[PDB]
């Protein structure tokens, strides 16, 4: 089955599950060429990002088609649509598949032969194959029961030289460390309660944030029941995961239960099989964002203040109206204990399949699949205004600027319903002639995908604590939604063969999609695939194969992008809205995204060539592929001048191109009876380039970014994901321009480009030891190149806690190349600068970025990471015998163990995001919770 003419990689269930990840994809993190895999954060139950051969869908569908058996699997993601204020991620659609049920993963990377799996495959395909029947030993029972801990990985690097203050002076109530140097003397701090105040030695507490986190605990129990006959098989499996991550409280919870029954039977001629699965999950998230969240509240802590000393609510000085600081921030323990952010999800999926062979050389297959889900979100936050505003310092004593106004409380609840039906009806033809072999396939595809939700929200809570749609004296808000798309296609795949030496393939498919304009539903995309095993004395060249392919992969549009719509009126204003009805009048407005019925289908073309060779009875192996992908005519709501009536128009874009090289080398230097040593090296390098966005709308469109701030674009000449940010003004000679009077840099007239999102190259290095029953595998993940936004640096800068801001021992400094612009009528003259950033304004110099200003907070995306370690002891059969056991493997493991990051980056594990497992996530990380080290044990027991 290496007739394949495009890159692809197979993995064995044992490798998948040996890392004991609660997920199927996060284990292969840095292990396969041209499969970029990153989890969104170390928060339990979150999404994983899997992008193959570059971002092609400029917004925002770049996951590959996961296909289980082989029915497409739903890969829907559930993250917040407002990462700046309420951040969370509740899951990837594939996170629900039980790794212990995987028998073989095969990632097809090539966009050229995709007609079997259709339009979604242009993103790659993740073909999973579930474990099946016996006979074996043995009653047919496996059991892996694991137990792991988790510890904080990288906290930002802090300064332990100056404590609580602002402008450099001492303050009792600040939320940052711009204070005098550490005397050791005794000063006050915190609010005043009942004519008393706390009083502590002014000394740094270097571990006060590290001490905040506990050790996350997660137990996992799995179980399978297996057996087979000459005409049947049957597999039943169950799995439970229960995580409580390293943030204090049950606030970071993930519970996963699955169930699965998979049976086949042959009686004929006729075969019928059926896979059915149920999957539960209950996540609770420790929200992120710029508001009153747990992390943004934690980082805003002076270096001398003891965090763990704030938990005890019986200590009045820690209750909310007397918390040590009022500046837009709350005790992080109170946040994790009184805010709610829950999700619960029930899902049913599976397939029916009826094979029927006939006339010697033919086979019939029908395959229906259904993947229905029901998920219920529930968030709510106290009425802090009613509980604490009157009569407290934080408080009535803080006027409008109190953190409590106007937090009058909120509760909301959304119930989502998803459902996909896929249908395949195929016929297959397999006849040898002389030395040839002809395999044909003709079929029909049917796909129906629908999603809907009912959301209801309620504000200003009457009983300040209780979360319930009946608990509020003000009008409630109500939202409702539903999308439904359908697709039908006809397809055919021809497979030719000559004495197991040449393998030629030709595919053709034609889809009618519901999302495209009526007079242009149909699109057609063929392909061709060659494999040559130029390996037909030695005994020295085991296997040699050369690969090429030229194919297309049409695609439709998102839903409802043709016709114009009149939404109910509503006006986006900074940090609010004005939404009709008002008052007693309802209203509709003309929709701000201009439709278009001239759309034509998207069309991806790919060229690929490859080469695979082995030596010395597969003791030295390598594989190389060169690819050239072009995703043309993509249907995108492209940005437009608001003066035109609309804010964007739906039109076919130009080519988004990914060229690159993918290389795998693997060898066994030592292989002796009792001892084998294995090396593996994989290297991917990819060249993103947007080739041309429609000119009439300008050059660029925004993919994500802040307002008046660091935003991330897609620009005509440039890669997918160009950043811009405020950069300081330079004279035509050097030369930081600074204000003649304060000393601080002067923002240049525009934002300067400051880098794309992409890695320049990605590679990993892996090694495996086997000595008797002992296994040892180590895997390193190396990604170098690119840049990302980090409020984690920003807020630690603003706050005077990052080590960086102990530069001039906070003594007043003159920016070391500074110069002044001297404007007389209309003549530009630069003077050697004489004005110093005073002590009082050192804060502002850093809060804004230093000499880089806003672009300061674009961090090097680059890291080396100790991905995983798997020590495995396979007990010898001779040790059992007297026992019911048929095999026992004790396993001890650790994941995301250590991360090494350039030098500009003392702030984040670069593997973070607050904008979801796809394109928009590459924007950055808006105080994502710390990433985490993981390590545990695992006990396999066959029966």
């Amino acid at each position: 089955e290496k007739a394949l003419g495009y890159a692809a990689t197979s993995v064995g269930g044992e490798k998948i599950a040996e890392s004991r990840t609660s997920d199927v994809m996060s284990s292969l993190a840095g292990k396969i060429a041209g499969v970029q895999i990153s989890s969104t954060s170390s928060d339990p139950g979150a999404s994983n990002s899997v992008i193959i051969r570059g971002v092609s869908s400029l917004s925002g569908t770049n996951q590959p088609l996961y296909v289980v058996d082989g029915v497409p699997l739903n890969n829907s993601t559930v993250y917040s649509t407002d990462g700046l204020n309420s951040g969370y991620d509740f899951g990837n659609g594939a996170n629900a598949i039980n790794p212990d049920d995987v028998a073989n993963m095969t990632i097809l990377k090539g966009a050229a032969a995709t007609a079997l799996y259709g339009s979604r495959a242009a993103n790659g395909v993740v073909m999973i194959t579930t474990k099946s029947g016996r006979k074996e030993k043995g009653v047919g029972i496996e059991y892996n029961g694991g137990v792991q801990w988790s510890t904080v990985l990288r906290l930002p690097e802090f300064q332990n030289e100056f404590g609580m203050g602002w402008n450099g002076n001492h303050t009792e109530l600040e939320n940052g460390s711009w204070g005098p140097r550490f005397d050791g003397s005794m000063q006050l701090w915190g609010n005043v309660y009942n004519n008393s105040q706390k009083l502590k030695p002014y000394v740094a507490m270097p571990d006060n944030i590290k001490d905040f986190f506990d050790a996350g605990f997660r137990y996992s129990n799995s179980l399978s029941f297996n057996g087979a006959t000459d005409k049947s098989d049957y597999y039943v499996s169950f799995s439970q995961i229960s995580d409580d991550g390293m943030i204090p409280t049950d606030a970071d919870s993930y519970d996963k239960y699955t169930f699965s029954a998979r049976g086949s039977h042959k009686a004929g001629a006729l075969t019928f099989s059926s896979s059915l699965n149920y999957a539960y999950q209950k996540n609770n998230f420790a929200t992120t964002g710029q508001g009153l969240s747990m992390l943004n509240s934690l980082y805003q802590t002076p270096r001398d203040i003891s965090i763990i000393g704030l938990e005890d609510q019986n200590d009045p000085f820690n209750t909310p109206g007397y918390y040590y600081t009022p500046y837009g921030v709350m005790n992080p323990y109170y946040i994790l204990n009184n805010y709610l952010n829950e999700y619960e999800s029930e899902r049913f999926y599976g397939k029916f399949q009826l094979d029927y062979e006939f006339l010697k050389y033919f086979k019939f297959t029908y395959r229906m699949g259904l993947d229905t889900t029901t998920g219920q979100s529930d968030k709510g936050k106290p009425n802090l205004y009613a509980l604490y505003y009157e009569g407290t310092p934080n408080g009535e004593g803080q006027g409008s600027s109190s953190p409590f106004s106007g937090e009058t409380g909120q509760y909301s609840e959304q119930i989502t319903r998803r459902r996909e039906i896929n249908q395949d009806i195929m016929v297959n033809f397999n006849m040898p002639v002389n030395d040839f072999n002809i395999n044909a396939l003709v079929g029909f595809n049917g796909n129906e995908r629908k999603v809907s939700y009912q959301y209801s929200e309620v504000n200003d809570l009457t009983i300040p604590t209780w979360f319930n749609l009946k608990n509020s004296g003000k009008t409630p808000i109500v939202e409702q939604h539903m999308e439904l798309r359908r697709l039908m296609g006809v397809f055919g795949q021809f497979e030719g063969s000559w004495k197991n030496m040449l393998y030629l393939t030709v595919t053709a498919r034609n889809d009618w999609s519901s999302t495209l304009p009526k007079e242009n539903r149909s699109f057609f995309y063929p392909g061709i695939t060659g494999s040559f095993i130029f390996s037909e004395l030695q005994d020295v060249i085991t296997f040699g194969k050369i690969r090429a392919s030229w194919g297309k992969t049409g695609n439709d549009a998102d839903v409802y992008m043709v016709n114009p719509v009149y939404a109910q009126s509503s006006n986006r204003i900074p940090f609010g809205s004005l939404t009709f009805p008002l008052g007693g009048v309802n209203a509709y407005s003309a929709g701000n995204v201009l439709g278009s019925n001239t759309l034509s289908p998207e069309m991806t073309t790919e060229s690929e060539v490859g080469l695979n060779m082995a030596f010395f009875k597969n003791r030295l192996s390598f594989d190389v592929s060169y690819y050239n992908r072009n995703t043309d005519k993509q249907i995108f709501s492209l940005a437009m001048d608001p003066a035109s009536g609309y804010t964007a128009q739906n039109m076919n874009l130009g080519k988004i191109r990914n060229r690159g090289i993918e290389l795998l080398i693997s060898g066994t230097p030592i292989r002796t009876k009792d001892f084998s040593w294995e090396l593996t090296w994989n290297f991917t390098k990819n060249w993103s380039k947007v080739i041309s966005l429609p000119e009439e709308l300008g050059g660029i469109t925004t993919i994500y970014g802040l307002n008046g701030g660091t935003s991330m674009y897609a620009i005509t000449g440039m890669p997918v994901g160009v950043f811009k940010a405020q950069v300081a003004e330079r004279d035509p000679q050097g030369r930081i321009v600074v204000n003649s009077s304060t000393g601080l840099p002067v923002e240049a007239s525009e934002f300067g480009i400051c880098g794309d999102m992409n890695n320049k190259y990605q590679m990993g290095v892996s090694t495996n030891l086997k000595y008797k029953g002992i296994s040892l595998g180590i895997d390193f993940d190396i990604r170098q190149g690119g840049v990302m936004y980090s409020r984690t640096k920003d807020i630690n800068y603003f706050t005077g806690n990052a080590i960086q801001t102990a530069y001039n021992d906070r003594n007043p400094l003159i920016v070391p190349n500074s110069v002044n612009k001297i404007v007389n009528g209309e003549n530009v003259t630069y003077v050697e600068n004489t004005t110093p950033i005073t002590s009082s304004n050192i804060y502002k110099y850093w809060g804004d970025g230093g000499s880089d200003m806003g672009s300061c907070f674009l961090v090097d995306k680059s890291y080396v990471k100790l991905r995983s370690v798997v020590l495995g002891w396979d007990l010898p059969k001779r040790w059992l015998a007297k026992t019911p056991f048929q095999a026992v493997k004790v396993s001890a493991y650790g994941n995301n163990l250590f991360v090494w990051t350039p030098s500009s980056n003392t702030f984040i594990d670069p593997e973070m995001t607050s904008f979801g497992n796809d394109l928009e996530g590459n924007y950055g990380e808006y105080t994502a919770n710390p990433s985490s080290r993981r390590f545990g044990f695992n006990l396999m027991v066959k029966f």
Binding site: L84, W166, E174, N175, G176, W178, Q290, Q300, P326, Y327, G328, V329, S401, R572, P574, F575, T702, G705, L706, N707, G708, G709, S711, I795, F798, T799, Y843
Partner: peptide, 10 residues
């Protein structure tokens, strides 16, 4: 539009 941040307190 384009999402707005917020400066803090000091």
């Amino acid at each position: 539009g384009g999402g707005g941040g917020g400066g803090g307190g000091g």
